[PDB]
């Protein structure tokens, strides 16, 4: 922000926004996948008990 003027600063920071959404949507996707495996064993544990 402090090295480039506002005419094209939004061009450079756009890649950061595009990259960081990609880096954040990926993280949640595995958490949805991984939680499914835990629930598979949690239901089995509830049956064992």
């Amino acid at each position: 922000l402090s090295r480039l003027d506002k005419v094209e600063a939004e061009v450079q920071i756009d890649r950061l926004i595009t990259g960081r959404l990609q880096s954040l949507q990926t993280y949640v996707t595995q958490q949805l996948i991984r939680a499914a495996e835990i629930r598979a064993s949690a239901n089995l544990a509830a049956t064992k008990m």
Binding site: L1, R20, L21, Q25, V28, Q31, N43, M49
Partner: protein, 49 residues
């Protein structure tokens, strides 16, 4: 957190993030579903009695 991760303590960066719409709200809802479901697992196994 919504904007602290991507555009923390920056007023300029939060402006372009807001243009993407409901990505902020949808992502926060996704994490809450996983967090609440974990307490269901512990209650289901140990609270038989």
């Amino acid at each position: 957190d919504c904007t602290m991760y991507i555009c923390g303590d920056s007023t300029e960066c939060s402006n372009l993030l807001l243009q993407y719409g409901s990505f902020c709200t949808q992502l926060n809802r996704a994490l809450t579903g996983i967090a609440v479901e974990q307490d269901k697992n512990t209650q289901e196994v140990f609270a038989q009695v």
